[PDB]
Write an enzyme that holds these catalytic residues in place. Structure first.
Site, PDB file in Angstrom:
ATOM      1  N   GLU A   1       1.617   0.273  -5.143  1.00 24.53           N
ATOM      2  CA  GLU A   1       1.273   1.449  -5.574  1.00 24.53           C
ATOM      3  C   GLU A   1       2.328   2.567  -5.676  1.00 24.53           C
ATOM      4  OE1 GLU A   1      -1.894   2.257  -2.530  1.00 24.53           O
ATOM      5  OE2 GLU A   1      -3.368   1.866  -4.200  1.00 24.53           O
TER       6      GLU A   1
ATOM      7  N   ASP B   1       0.852  -1.017  -0.066  1.00 21.96           N
ATOM      8  CA  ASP B   1       0.184   0.056   0.011  1.00 21.96           C
ATOM      9  C   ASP B   1       1.101   1.070   0.008  1.00 21.96           C
ATOM     10  OD1 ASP B   1      -2.655   1.237   0.297  1.00 21.96           O
ATOM     11  OD2 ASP B   1      -1.768   2.067   2.296  1.00 21.96           O
TER      12      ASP B   1
END
Ligand SMILES: [Ca+2]
Ligand SMILES: [Ca+2]
Ligand SMILES: [Ca+2]
Ligand SMILES: [Ca+2]
Lengths: 341, 714, 341
Positions: free
Chosen positions: B334, B305
Site C-alpha cells: 500500500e 502493509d
C-alpha cells in the site's frame, strides 16, 4: 531550492446549502486540500452549547469530553456539520475542534442576521467567519492578516510558521509580495530557522513570549528590508503554501534605530546658526522639506539627509525660515494599503 | 532490568513468552519432500508476473465455518490439508479456472490473540465458556444466558430476530465475544520471523513451523497456487519499558520506533507504534526477516502493509537482497502518502514508477466501486460506481453528473490498461491525454511504468465488501439477478485488465459482512464465508456501532431493497467468476506485462465527449503493426463490458470477422455473454449487464489486427 | 526553425445524427480546424445524382453549374449536408465540391449496408469514407497513406505538399515518425524546396508527371535515409500539421543503386574458387547467410559485406557448401508494418 506555489485546486462552491431550522458550518481544510490523499474527519467535532447570548441551538451536547458531534459529511475541501436549530433568528456558539482541542482560538458566535443564508465557512486558527467556502479559500491562499512580528534585528515571531517545513521572509521594495500567473512566489526571500524567544524579547513583549521564534540569516540587510514590504510565508516540503501573512515591524524598528534616534532632537529646531529640521522615519524611502509662503505656495523643496544609525532625516536652513510654513513630503510603504505612499 | 524475547526469534513458547533455539533446516520441521517444492506459477518475466491472479484469504475466514473440515483443524494452517472439504475443493476449482496466488492475511507472530486455549472462547462453544473467560459478559445485558445450555452461535441467531437499527443486540454481544475470541486479522506484530501459534494445533514449541510448511506444500502442490505473505513492518504492537508486547523498544530504546521531533513520544501515524525502517538496524531486521520467509518458508511474494511509511531506498535495498535467495520474488504494498516526505523519499505509488515494486491502485477501485473510503451516511448511496449504475441506472439519492460519470469511465479504462503514466487516451471531453494527465483527486491518475507495478481490485479485507457496496449503491430497480451480474461486471474490470488482478476471498460467493466496514475484530460472525453455499452472510445483524453507527439509517433504507442470495445465486456468481479468470488465462494478450507492449497494442473505443455510459470497450492488437505474434491463434482481442440496464450496439468493428470466446460459448445460458449477438456484418449486440470477449482469429499468417491510434508517443 | 505540431482541438463527435429516409455527410475541414477564425462554407456544395448503380437519392439537382446544394449547417470541424432519401437501402453518388471543383478526387459511393448509421464523414482529397468525424480527424492528423514518391536522389513528388508553406522529409532509423506527448514532430528532418519534374523523371514515371516536385537539400545522405522510415510532412506557416504521409522509395532505389546493382550476379553462385552468395537489399540494415544441415540445424551464420554503390550484400565460402541449405537473415524496415523486421 524549493519554489513556494499555490495548490492546483479549483475554488469551492459550498457543496451544502443550509435549509429551514438548521445551519451549516464548513471547515475549509487547508491540510486536506494541499493533499492529493483522502482525509479522515472522524477526529473533527464541534462543541455546541446554549447560553444567555446565543441560544438558537437545538439539543446541544453538555459533555465537553463528547467528541460524538462528528461531521455530517465531507469532500476535497473539508468537512461540514448540518446543525439543527430551535429558531432561524438569533445566533449559535460553535467551538471547532479536532478531539478535545480548539481548532479556532476564539469562541465563534454565528449571527444569522449577519449571514442571511445560514451557510457559513471557517478555517483553522482563523477566528473569522465567511459567507462562502470560496471567500474562505481565497483568504486561506492569500497574503492575509498581520500574524508575524519582527521583534528584533534577528528574530521573527510567528505561531503560523510553527513546525512548518518551509518558513521564509519574502520581501519587495516597490511592489506587493504575491503569486504570479503560474501561482508561484518569485519575489526575493530569506530562509528562517527555528529558535527560542530571547530573554530580552520576553521582557519587551510578554504578550508574544508563547509565539514560535525564527532566526533570520546573518547576511540579512535589516535596513533595506524595512524600506518596503515583508511577508512571512509557511509552506509544505513540496512548496505548497500553507500561510502568507503581513509583518508587524515596530519591535525591530526599536531594536535597530531607537538607541541612536533617542539621542536626537526633533521638529523644526530654530536656534542660533539657523534651523535644523529633523523627522524620524526609519522606513521612508524618501523625505523632503517643502517650504511654503503665507499664501501656501511652494518656496523650496529640499531632500533630507538620512542618518543610517537612527533612521532620522534632517535638513539645515537659514534663520530666514523663522515663520515659514512646511510639511514633509514622504515616500513610504504603508502596510494598511500595502503601497508605497 | 527485564527479560526480553529475541527480535530475531525463529521459534517461540505459547503466547510468545519465551524464544526457542531452533534450526529451520531440520528434516523434523519439514513436510515430506519440502526440499524439492517448486513455485507452481512462474514469476520470471513481466508477462509471467502480469498473469498473477490473487485471492486474499484469512486462516479463520477459510475453515472456521466449514463442517467438512475436521473440527480440530478448523481455523488452523492444517485445514488446507482437508482435501475432502467444501473450502479446499472450492479453492481447488478456483485454481483450475485461473486463480494463481493465495495471499495470507497476518500469519507471522501476532500479539492480539491469546495462544492459551483456556483463556479464549469462540461462538462454536457454550455460552457458559464465554462468561468463564470474559468477566464483562457476567455483568452485561446478556448475563442471563450464562445459565442457558445454548452456544454463543445459538444465542447470536436468536438476537437476529429482534435486531434493528434501534435495537443493535447482535453487535452488542459480538463486541464482548471479540475480546476473548481467536479472531483478529493480525496487523499487530509481536515477532516478525515466527509463524502465529494460534493457527497451529499446539502453540508450544516448533509444531507451528512444520504445520505452516505443511500448509505451504498443500497450497503449492495439492492446490497448485503460489503464496503471498502479508507483512507489517510499519509498526510494532507496542513500545516502552512496560508493555508485554514491547520487544524492540525494550532492547534498544528510542531506536527502532519513529519518535516525535520535540517530545520523543513514539508516533502513531500507522495506528499503534510507528517503526523506523529509515534506521540502519531496523532496515537490516526487515531484510533478514524476509530472507527466512523466502528460503525457509518458500514464500513467493510479499505485500507490505502501509508501505508509504517505508523509505523507497529501504524497499529497493531489501528487494535486491531477497532477489539473491529467489530471483523471481515479487514485492508490492500500500503505497499511499504517509506524510513522511519531510524525513525521506517515501515508497509511494508515484515514487515507485519503474522500480519494479508494485502498489495497489485506488484509481480503478474507486471508479468501479463508487465514492471513496471515509464515505459515511447517505454518501455511501449517493456516490454510485460503474457497477452500481452511476449515470445509467441512478438510485433515489444520486446527483452524479454526466461529466462526473464520464470521468469514472476515464479512470476505469486507464486502470484496465494497467494505470500507466505515459498511456495516451481520449478523455471525457475528447482531448488526447497521457495517463498522468488524468486527474484522481488532485493526483496524476496514471503513475506506473509497467502494468506489473499496478494491483487492481474492487474488494479487500479492509472497507465494505463489493456486495455490501452494491447493496448501498444499486437502484431500488436492480433485482437480485442484475446485482449478481453487477458484482461480476465490477470484477471484470480487474480480471480482464492489464494490471495485476487482486481480489478478496469470498467475492465469487457474493461475500457480505452485513455492512461491516472494519471487520478486524468482528469475529467469526461478521467475517463468515459459507463454503456450503446457503448464503453470503448478508443481513446477519447491525454492524459495529463504534464504526458503522453513523450509517445505520442508510443501512435500513437499503437492507431490505433486495432478497438475500441463496445456493442458486452463489453458484451463478462462482460460474461467472470462473468464466472471467478462465478468459484472463485464455490469451497472452490479456497479460502483456511490459508498459511499451501495452501502449503499442492496447486502445479503447466508445471514448470522447459523445460516449455511451457504462460501455467499456478495450482492443488489444496482435497484428503486424504491433510487432510479434504473441497469440498463434489470434490477431487481436476485444473486451466489451456493458455496465448499463439498456442493451447496446457495436458498429465500431464494421465488417471485422469476430467470434465470441470458446470459454463464453461453452458457458451458454450461464455466460456473462449470454445473448451477445455477432452479425455476419460485424455488428455486435450486447445485452444489459454483460461482458464479452470478442476475438479476431488469425489466418494462415499474422495479418493487420486492431492497430492503436498512435495519436501521441514519448 | 518552426516545430511541426498537432492542432490544440478536441476530437469531434458527429454533431448531427442521420434520421429516417435521410443521410448525413460531414466534411472534416482541416483548414477550418487549423484556424482559430470562423469559416464561410457558402462555396461548399455537393453534386448529387441518381444512376443505375446508386439511385437512393431524393430529388438530385441535374445542373452541374448548380452550386445551390450548400451545407445544411456547420461548426468548428466543418460543414455537413442532411441529404434526403428515397429508400434507406442501396447507395448514393456524392461529389464533394468548393464551387464547380471536386474536393475529393474519386466519385464517392456511400453504401448504407457498409455504414449502418447513415452518418458518414469525408476529408478533402482523401477518397475514403469514415463512420465518424473522430475516425476522420484521427486519419487527418496522423501519418496516413503513402502519398509521397522519392523518385530520384534529389526529387520527392507529392501533390499534398503543393503550395504548402512548410514541406519536410522527416526520418527515423529505428522508430516510427510520430507526434510526442506534447503533439510535436521532434524527429530529424530535411527541408524541401519547390522544383519542377525532370525530363528524365517524366519519362520514367509518366503517371506522376502532374505531381508537385520538391528538391531535397544537397547535404542529404540518401543512403542512410533509405535505412529506415521517411515521412513527408506538410505544415502551416505556424507549424500546424496539414498532412503526414509515408514515402514510396522505389524510384530513388533505381536511381541510386540500379546502375551498379545491374552489373552483378545474384544467388548462391557456386563456381571454381568457391561459392559467392549475393543478395540485393539496398535498404536492409543487416543481412547474414545462415547455413543449415540436411536436418535444418544451423551450421554457420555469416554477416554479409555491403557494397555501397549497389546496395548488394555478399559472402564468399568454400566449394564444401555445394548442397548446403540456406536463408538470408534480414534486418529491414518494412513500410507496410512500419517496423524494422
Ligand atoms: Ca501470538
Ligand atoms: Ca480478538
Ligand atoms: Ca513527520
Ligand atoms: Ca497473432
Amino acid at each position: 531550492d524549493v519554489v513556494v506555489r499555490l495548490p492546483d485546486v479549483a475554488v469551492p462552491g459550498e457543496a451544502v446549502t443550509a435549509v429551514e431550522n438548521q445551519a451549516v458550518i464548513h471547515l475549509v481544510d487547508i491540510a486536506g486540500i494541499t493533499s492529493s490523499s483522502a482525509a479522515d474527519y472522524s477526529s473533527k467535532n464541534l462543541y455546541l452549547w446554549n447560553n444567555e447570548t446565543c441560544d438558537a441551538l437545538s439539543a446541544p451536547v453538555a459533555d465537553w469530553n463528547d467528541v460524538s458531534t462528528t461531521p455530517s459529511g465531507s469532500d476535497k475541501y473539508g468537512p461540514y456539520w448540518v446543525i439543527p436549530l430551535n429558531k432561524e433568528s438569533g445566533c449559535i456558539n460553535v467551538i471547532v475542534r479536532d478531539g478535545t482541542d480548539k481548532l479556532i482560538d476564539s469562541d465563534l458566535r454565528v449571527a444569522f442576521g449577519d449571514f442571511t443564508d445560514r451557510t457559513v465557512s471557517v478555517i483553522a486558527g482563523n477566528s473569522a467567519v465567511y459567507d462562502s467556502r470560496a471567500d474562505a479559500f481565497r483568504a486561506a491562499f492569500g497574503v492575509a492578516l498581520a500574524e508575524a512580528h519582527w521583534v528584533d534585528k534577528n528574530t521573527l515571531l510567528w505561531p503560523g510558521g510553527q513546525d512548518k517545513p518551509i518558513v521564509r521572509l519574502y520581501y519587495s521594495h516597490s511592489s506587493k509580495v504575491a503569486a504570479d500567473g503560474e501561482g508561484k512566489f518569485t519575489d526575493r526571500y530569506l530562509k528562517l530557522t527555528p529558535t527560542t524567544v530571547s530573554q530580552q524579547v520576553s521582557m519587551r513583549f510578554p504578550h508574544l513570549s508563547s509565539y514560535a521564534a525564527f532566526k533570520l540569516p546573518d547576511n540579512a540587510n535589516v535596513d533595506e528590508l524595512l524600506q518596503g514590504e515583508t511577508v512571512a510565508i509557511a509552506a509544505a516540503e513540496d512548496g505548497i503554501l500553507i500561510s502568507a501573512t503581513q509583518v508587524q515591524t515596530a519591535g525591530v524598528l526599536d531594536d535597530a534605530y531607537a538607541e541612536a534616534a533617542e539621542a536626537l532632537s526633533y521638529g523644526a529646531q530654530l536656534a542660533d546658526g539657523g534651523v535644523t529640521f529633523r523627522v524620524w522615519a526609519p522606513t521612508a524611502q524618501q523625505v523632503d522639506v517643502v517650504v511654503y509662503s503665507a499664501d501656501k505656495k511652494v518656496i523650496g523643496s529640499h531632500p533630507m539627509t538620512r542618518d543610517s544609525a537612527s533612521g532620522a532625516w534632517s535638513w539645515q536652513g537659514g534663520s530666514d525660515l523663522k515663520g515659514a510654513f512646511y510639511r514633509y513630503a514622504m515616500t513610504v510603504y504603508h502596510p494598511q494599503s500595502r503601497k508605497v505612499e | 532490568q527485564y527479560e526480553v524475547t529475541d527480535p530475531y526469534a525463529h521459534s517461540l513458547s505459547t503466547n510468545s513468552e519465551y524464544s526457542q533455539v531452533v534450526d529451520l533446516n531440520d528434516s523434523a520441521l519439514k513436510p515430506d519432500g519440502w526440499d524439492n517444492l517448486t513455485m507452481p506459477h512462474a514469476q520470471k518475466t513481466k508477462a509471467d508476473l502480469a498473469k498473477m491472479t490473487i485471492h486474499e484469504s484469512h486462516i479463520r475466514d477459510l475453515s472456521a465455518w466449514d463442517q467438512t473440515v475436521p473440527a480440530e483443524l478448523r481455523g488452523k494452517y492444517l485445514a488446507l490439508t482437508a482435501g475432502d472439504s467444501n473450502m479446499v475443493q472450492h479453492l481447488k476449482t478456483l485454481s483450475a479456472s485461473g486463480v494463481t496466488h493465495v495471499e495470507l492475511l497476518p500469519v507471522f507472530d501476532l500479539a492480539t490473540v491469546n495462544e492459551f486455549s483456556d483463556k479464549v472462547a469462540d461462538i462454536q462453544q457454550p455460552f457458559s465458556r464465554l462468561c468463564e473467560v470474559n468477566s464483562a459478559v457476567k455483568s452485561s445485558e446478556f448475563a442471563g444466558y450464562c445459565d442457558s445450555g445454548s452456544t454463543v452461535e445459538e444465542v447470536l441467531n436468536q438476537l437476529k430476530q429482534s435486531d434493528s437499527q434501534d435495537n443493535p443486540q447482535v453487535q452488542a454481544l459480538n463486541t464482548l465475544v471479540a475480546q476473548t475470541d481467536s479472531y483478529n486479522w493480525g496487523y499487530d506484530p509481536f515477532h516478525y520471523t515466527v509463524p502465529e501459534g494460534s493457527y497451529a494445533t499446539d502453540p508450544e514449541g516448533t509444531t507451528r513451523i512444520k504445520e505452516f510448511r505443511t500448509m505451504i506444500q498443500a497450497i503449492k502442490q495439492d492446490l497448485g497456487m503460489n503464496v503471498i505473505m502479508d507483512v507489517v513492518y510499519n509498526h510494532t504492537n507496542a513500545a516502552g519499558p512496560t508493555d508485554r508486547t514491547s520487544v524492540l523498544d525494550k532492547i534498544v530504546p528510542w531506536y527502532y520506533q519513529r519518535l516525535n521531533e520535540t517530545t520523543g513520544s513514539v508516533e502513531s501515524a500507522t495506528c499503534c507504534s510507528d517503526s523506523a525502517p529509515e534506521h540502519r538496524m531496523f532496515a537490516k531486521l526487515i531484510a533478514d526477516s524476509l530472507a527466512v520467509w523466502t528460503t525457509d518458508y518458500k514464500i513467493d511474494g510479499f505485500r507490505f502493509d502501509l508501505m508509504g511509511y517505508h523509505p523507497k531506498a529501504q524497499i529497493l535495498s531489501a528487494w535486491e537482497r531477497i532477489k539473491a535467495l529467489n530471483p523471481d520474488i515479487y514485492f508490492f504494498g500500500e503505497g499511499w502518502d504517509s506524510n513522511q516526505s519531510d524525513r525521506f523519499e517515501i515508497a509511494s505509488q508515484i515514487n515507485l514508477k519503474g522500480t519494479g515494486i508494485g502498489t495497489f491502485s485506488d484509481r480503478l477501485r474507486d471508479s468501479v466501486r463508487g465514492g471513496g473510503p471515509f464515505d459515511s451516511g447517505d454518501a455511501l448511496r449517493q456516490n454510485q460506481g460503474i457497477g452500481s449504475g452511476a449515470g445509467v441506472l441512478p438510485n433515489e439519492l444520486a446527483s452524479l453528473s454526466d461529466d462526473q460519470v464520464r470521468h469514472l469511465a476515464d479512470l476505469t479504462r486507464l486502470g484496465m490498461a494497467g494505470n500507466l503514466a505515459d498511456f495516451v487516451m481520449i478523455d471525457k471531453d475528447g482531448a488526447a491525454k497521457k495517463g498522468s494527465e488524468i486527474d484522481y483527486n488532485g493526483a496524476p491518475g496514471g503513475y506506473a511504468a509497467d502494468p506489473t507495478e499496478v494491483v487492481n481490485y474492487v474488494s479487500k479485507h479492509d472497507n465494505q465488501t463489493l456486495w455490501d457496496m452494491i447493496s448501498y449503491k444499486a437502484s431500488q430497480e436492480a433485482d437480485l439477478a442484475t446485482r449478481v451480474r453487477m458484482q461480476a461486471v465490477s470484477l471484470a474490470t480487474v480480471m480482464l485488465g492489464q494490471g495485476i488482478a487482486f481480489d478478496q476471498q469470498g467475492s465469487e460467493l457474493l461475500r457480505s459482512k452485513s455492512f461491516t466496514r472494519d471487520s478486524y475484530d468482528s469475529g467469526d460472525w461478521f467475517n463468515r464465508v459459507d463454503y456450503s453455499l446457503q448464503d453470503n452472510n448478508y443481513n446477519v445483524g447491525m454492524p459495529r456501532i463504534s464504526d458503522d453507527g453513523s450509517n445505520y439509517e442508510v443501512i435500513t433504507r437499503v437492507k431490505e431493497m433486495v432478497a438475500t442470495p441463496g445456493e442458486a445465486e452463489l453458484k451463478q456468481m462462482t460460474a461467472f467468476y470462473q468464466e472471467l479468470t478462465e478468459l484472463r488465462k485464455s490469451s497472452p494478450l490479456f497479460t502483456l506485462g511490459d508498459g511499451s507492449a501495452v501502449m503499442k497494442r492496447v486502445d479503447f473505443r466508445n471514448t470522447g465527449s459523445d460516449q455511451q455510459a457504462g460501455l467499456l470497450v478495450m482492443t488489444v492488437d496482435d497484428g503486424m503493426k504491433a510487432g510479434a505474434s504473441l497469440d498463434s491463434r489470434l490477431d487481436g482481442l476485444v473486451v466489451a463490458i456493458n455496465a448499463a440496464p439498456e442493451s447496446r450496439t457495436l458498429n465500431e468493428f464494421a465488417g471485422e470477422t469476430l467470434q465470441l470466446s470458446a470459454i463464453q460459448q461453452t458457458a451458454g445460458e450461464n455466460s456473462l455473454a449470454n445473448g451477445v449477438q455477432i452479425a455476419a456484418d460485424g455488428t455486435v449486440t450486447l445485452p444489459a449487464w454483460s461482458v464479452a470477449v470478442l476475438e479476431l482469429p488469425q489466418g494462415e499468417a499474422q495479418g493487420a489486427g486492431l492497430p492503436v491510434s498512435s495519436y501521441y508517443h514519448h
